[PDB]
Amino acid sequence: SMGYPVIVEATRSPIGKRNGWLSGLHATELLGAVQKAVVDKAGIQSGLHAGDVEQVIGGCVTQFGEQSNNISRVAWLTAGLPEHVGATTVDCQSGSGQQANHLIAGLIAAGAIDVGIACGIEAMSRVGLGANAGPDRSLIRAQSWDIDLPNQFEAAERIAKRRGITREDVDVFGLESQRRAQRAWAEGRFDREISPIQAPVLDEQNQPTGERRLVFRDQGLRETTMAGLGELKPVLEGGIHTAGTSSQISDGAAAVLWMDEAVARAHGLTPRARIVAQALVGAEPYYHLDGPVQSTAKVLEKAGMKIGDIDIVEINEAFASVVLSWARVHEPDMDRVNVNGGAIALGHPVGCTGSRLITTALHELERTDQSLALITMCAGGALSTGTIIERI
Template sequence: MALASKGIFVVGAKRTPFCKYGGSLRELPASQAFAAAAKDALNSGNLNPTLVDSTVVGNVNFLSQCDGGKTPRYCGIYAGVSIDKPALGVNKACGSGLQALLTGVTEILTGSADVCLTGGTELMSSLPILVRNVRFGTTLGSTYHFEDHIKKRFLDSYTGLSLEKMAENIAVKYNISREMSDDFALKSYLKWKAGQESKHFNDELTSLKVILRKKEVLVDRDELTEVNITSDNMAKSLPLLEDGAVVTSLNSSVPADGAAALVLANEATIKRNNLIPLARVSGWATVGVDPLETGLAAVPAVKKLLQVTDTDIDSVDLFEVNETFAAQVLATVTELKIDDSKVNVNGGALVLGNPVAATGARMAVHLVHHLNHIKAKRAIAVSSCGGGQGVAVMFEAI
């Protein structure tokens, strides 16, 4: 699926700080995290929440969160959307936040909505510890093990491989060394640090108050898992796989908590309410690939997007490529022949962490603000998704 479009605009875009696993957002419901960003996005866009016709929210690990499958519904209600307006949850693994945006775009293009509240939310801290084979009774003398859903590397049923093994295979295929991966991850941290110091995130961040250990805490900046990343501790990090040499915990993204919201509107709504849009959604593409090539699905997604929008790679000023693993971003940049100075210019998931369904929406939020900040024209957010899928979205400055 791919389409070029000119009549859909982003009128508000905000995100919560991304917080480390077990950090400041750990006791906040996923719907409340999204609502905080959504209310700020609506307010910053000068849009009354009652004008929202539909809420579409990415949320992958919904069963572990307090509202379960109802999370997207309450994302809208808690943000002020009228109760009579519907909501939809989207799960496209790491591309969920971007797919939620595209689903909202489609609703507007088909005329079923004028304004859509979209984005993604994920509280990885709420993921469970599992105990298998006890639901229907236990056996005397049997041993039952706790499985940490965060730490356990689950094998994909189709490929029989873990994501870490697939990333290791990509590194081998593209001759990506451990040093190259470590260098990319370190640069992601340094770019985020420079962006933080230059206040590049100020326009996109939503501050919120949470209750943590029975005390009210203000969360107003990103909370990193690793607060002092250096080339020395990068080099000392051990490979994650016994038979691997490249993929480590420091050149891979780690679980995190966060939410990001984008408000979309058509041209008639913009004119009728005198809104000032942040950017235009000018095209998108979604693709499927062999699940063995999961980490490279961003490549055909971008190629298809450029084709449908009649655009060449050099005319795109900014790229946000999901940093699940450093190796797969390096391979993507190589395959697409992207100028690496345009890629993840203020860091990515390698430093911020990866709240799965929120990451794609965070990339989009950052791009629509940074386009205006540096007065650029065009940007693409792209993610490879588990199971062999890719999703890419193009934004243009107004």
């Protein structure tokens, strides 16, 4: 009574800007929409229906208000999907929605379920970072705490210094992300993975205009240039990172439909990819967001591969210096790294990205008819997730 988990479908909403094109939706409606999206997608070509899903696991970071009370379950019920399907919500910060695919893969593996949905939601426009704690952030740690665990903006500086990354270095990476995202969109790469989402049109204020617009484009793309990026002011006094070279605050959701390979084939669905190796490792608190070194390491070790074997990497662009520190250590081919742009241009709904990255990856492997992809992400509390997926 065990199983062989495979990705059967994956899809994502477009990613909206803060107070942008999806900010009209209640966070539970966004996630619901996407949850319904994957099931519907899989229903085109098969018998599969929402009731056939057994468990849903959703990543979400700031689990407060609209994102309190186990948003994965509420989203599901709110989309009018079947009440018998279980659902759990998870937090390993920015790893959450990646970690969620690992967990569904595990339950399938253990024979607990045959059909699962991993997903991730973040509606930063509506629940901002910090919403989940009082204003006195000193209080969310015990008085004993003495770990030099810096904030994330300081972490990107500490990492940069460690590797000798410079303001020009990042501004260049920054620019390429915008360049490559703009290229993907021009060529139509994201068309398949994206599920247009209807959304309340809001006015110049943040009130609804009665209109219900269909959104299908990532809103963070922006004509960008080395000059423009050079003009931008650092986030921290003396730091190298700016809005131009950090991720964007965003609204979005993604979902990935998993099954035991045999059940999939039985419903007449095509097994599309499988996890070769997965990991959620702890990182070094001091540098905090440099974990992608460690997670990339583990899954390569577990997979019995070397970075050379990977065709496509998705390493989340929380901060330029995170991706560059990783590249400096693991020396990959940067033509294979964030080939369709990263979060610096596409934005970074925290709980969602992990499932978004897997989604993006799978599709690119399929577009280019390649095989192995690595996904890896730094995360608050000094943790990093890692996956190597493989096309089937």
